[PDB]
């Protein structure tokens, strides 16, 4: 039942998933001046170069760039990480004007869009398991601006054309996600959730201080998919992000400065 409308958006999850109101949720508001930091934290690792991408879905709230998860292939460990965990797939989320649509805020400041490349730890044997540990994902979350374009994103959004409606999809093969990372790998980091139902409180969140810059034209080509189904009234794919939830007792960490 769920989505991003006045009736069954982020306002409406708690009633299927009571969680919502939990003790760990996400995004939450990065307070950049009562972060802490921590000179204990190592440099994230970052292991790309043998990522293998499979598919790209719209699912009806996102489109998701899916990866062959079966060998230890595309890793992330290091940084606040105990262990290695392994990409599985990424989307995004991004508003109806470039004023809004980042799921994280920094000092309130909206970003265009949001980037989530989503792990699971490799010690619970895969991602169905690890999802039900509360430490078994690492969500990496990439902050984007309007302004130059990314080489990188343009073969993903040229793919989107042929996804516009929830259910369908493509052969989406050989996409390098090195090409959606700024140059600097500083981050913040906090225990929270999925910030989509179920909700789940699982993620190890480590939020890059830089953004990349997409250009207007990307950003358009976000926002002509669509929520609904083929053969459904046209319901633009805008505006699906979670607002910023109570951060209660946790310590947003810093890796720098
Ligand atoms: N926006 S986010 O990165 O926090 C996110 C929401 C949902 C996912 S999941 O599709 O991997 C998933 C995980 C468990 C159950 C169902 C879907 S990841
Ligand atoms: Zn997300």
């Given at each position: ?23 760990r949720?996400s995004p939450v508001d990065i307070d950049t001046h009562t972060a802490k930091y921590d000179p204990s934290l190592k440099p994230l690792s970052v ?29 992330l460990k290091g940084g606040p990480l105990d262990g290695?965990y ?18 994280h805020?920094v000092d ?11 792990h ?14 509360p430490d078994?994902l690492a969500v990496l979350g990439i ?39 700024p140059?600097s790998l500083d981050y913040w980091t906090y225990p929270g ?10 993620v190890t969140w480590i939020v890059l201080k830089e ?36 951060l209660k007792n946790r310590q947003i960490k810093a890796s720098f400065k």
């Open positions: 039942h769920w989505g991003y409308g006045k009736h069954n958006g982020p306002e409406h999850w708690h009633k299927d998933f009571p969680i919502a109101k939990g003790e949720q292991s790309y170069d043998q990522a293998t991408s499979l598919r790209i879905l719209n699912n009806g709230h996102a489109f998701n760039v899916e990866f062959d998860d079966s060998q230890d292939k595309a890793v290695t392994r990409l599985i797939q990424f989307h995004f989320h991004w508003g109806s004007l470039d004023g809004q649509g980042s799921e805020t309130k400041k909206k970003y265009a869009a949001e980037l989530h490349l989503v699971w730890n490799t010690k619970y044997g895969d991602f169905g398991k690890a999802v039900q540990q078994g902050f984007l601006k309007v302004g130059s374009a990314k080489p990188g994103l343009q073969k993903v959004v040229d793919v989107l054309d042929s996804i516009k409606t929830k259910g369908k999809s493509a052969d989406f093969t050989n996409f390098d996600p090195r090409g959606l990372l140059e959730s999925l910030t989509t139902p179920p909700l789940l409180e699982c953004p990349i810059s997409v250009s207007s034209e990307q950003v358009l080509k976000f926002r002509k998919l669509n929520f609904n189904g083929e053969g459904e009234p046209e319901e633009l794919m805008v505006d699906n992000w979670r607002p910023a939830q109570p």
